Design a protein around this ligand. Structure first.
Ligand SMILES: CC[C@@H](CC(=O)N[C@H]1[C@@H]2C[C@H]3C[C@@H](C2)C[C@@H]1C3)n1c(N)nc2cc(Cl)ccc21
Length: 377
């Protein structure tokens, strides 16, 4: 799969994109890779932030579905016109497929000024496809129309400039070390999984595990942060806050309302606790755990714009939508979306940012009881 290694690019906090082509002759676009949604959507109009956009008039293979889509979210929205056309992935499997494309024709606070992507490849399941589940997601089309196996994997590196690999239809063994550990995909809408235990340094957190998955826990390359339900956010920060009593910070920092700086090059990582999530294992009463570092949840901020030094954002934040395992979790690990076997595998990434003393890890097996009681009904 060396065709596919390092085919992801991007910029810090603007997401990871892959090169894709649409229509005949092919139009090249950068497309944000997103495991948190299920539409293939693309700029179709000359919005001033876009570098390029889908021009259906040039495509002899485009077919109008005569149907509009409206997708609103907390702050903004995208809207578009549905269609199908021929899609391929240059640094992907050497194949072409007829897929659905939403031609984005109006949006608010969707595109990122200064980014180099022009659309979004929602890699998740039909059940959260918009406007409804009859709109076949890109990846279903791909598997259905070719001999590509039903799974992909992400190695997200990140470092302004980021890179990674999306392996379509397989696993590249050089992208990780140690062994893959798999957690079940609870239902096929988002990539839903169940967290069964949470430890900060080692001190578990002693919460009804159900809090950890309220009302869901997902895996999302479209989110930067590790996001925790309100209640789990408290006990974690309060416990992280205790772990790092070699220093004192304003309450606003923990809230992701203000950032924090140290003389250019003098951050003490050791004051900061490792974080462990245990995930439901493949077997009754069996879990494993993933461990991330401060280097994962304290992220550099580019904008030393009215500052000089090394300022970091607390990259763990609260949620009314459940746990989101975003880039903060994913950049530690190689992640296999084993769609065919309804499961997600994690392994220590070969690219991840390690230091001298501590290392991101994936360990098992452990014994955890009542794991099914951790899901939401
Ligand atoms: C469910 C979690 C959220 C997180 C999120 O809001 N991501 C942002 C981010 C920046 C823009 C482009 C892309 C990644 C989706 C969305 C807007 N999310 C994801 N993963 N894909 C989304 C698509 C939409 Cl229309 C709204 C929220 C989305």
């Amino acid at each position: 799969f060396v065709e596919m290694v390092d085919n992801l690019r991007g910029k810090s906090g603007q997401g990871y994109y892959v090169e894709m082509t649409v229509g005949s002759p092919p139009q090249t676009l950068n497309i944000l890779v997103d495991t948190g949604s299920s539409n293939f959507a693309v700029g179709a109009a000359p919005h001033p932030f876009l570098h390029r956009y889908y021009q259906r008039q040039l495509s002899s293979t485009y077919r109008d579905l005569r149907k509009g889509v409206y997708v609103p979210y907390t702050q903004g929205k995208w809207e578009g016109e549905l269609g199908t056309d021929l899609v391929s992935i240059p640094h992907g499997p050497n194949v072409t497929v007829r897929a659905n494309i939403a031609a984005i024709t109006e949006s608010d606070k969707f595109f990122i000024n200064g980014s180099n992507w022009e659309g979004i490849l929602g890699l998740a399941y039909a059940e959260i496809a918009r406007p409804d589940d009859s709109l076949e997601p890109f990846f279903d089309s791909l598997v259905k129309q070719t001999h590509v196996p039903n799974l992909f994997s992400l190695q997200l590196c990140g470092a302004a400039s980021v890179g990674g690999s999306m392996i379509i239809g397989g696993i590249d063994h050089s992208l990780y070390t140690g062994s893959l550990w798999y957690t079940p995909i609870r239902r096929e809408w988002y990539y839903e999984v169940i967290i069964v235990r949470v430890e900060i340094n080692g001190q578990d957190l002693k919460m009804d595990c159900k809090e950890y998955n309220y009302d869901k826990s997902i895996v999302d390359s479209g989110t930067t942060n590790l996001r925790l339900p309100k209640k789990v956010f408290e006990a974690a920060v309060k416990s992280i806050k205790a772990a790092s009593s070699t220093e004192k910070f304003p309450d606003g920092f923990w809230l992701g309302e203000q950032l924090v700086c140290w003389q250019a090059g003098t951050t003490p990582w050791n004051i900061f606790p490792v974080i462990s999530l245990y995930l439901m294992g493949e077997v009754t009463n069996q879990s494993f755990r993933i461990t991330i570092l401060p280097q994962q949840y304290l992220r550099p901020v580019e904008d030393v714009a009215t500052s000089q030094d090394d300022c970091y954002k607390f990259a763990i934040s609260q949620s009314s939508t459940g746990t989101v395992m975003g880039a903060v979790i994913m950049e530690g690990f190689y992640v296999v979306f084993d769609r065919a076997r309804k499961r997600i595998g994690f392994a220590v990434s070969a690219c991840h940012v390690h230091d001298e003393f501590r290392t991101a890890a994936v360990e098992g097996p452990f014994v955890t009881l009542d794991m099914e009681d951790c899901g939401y009904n």
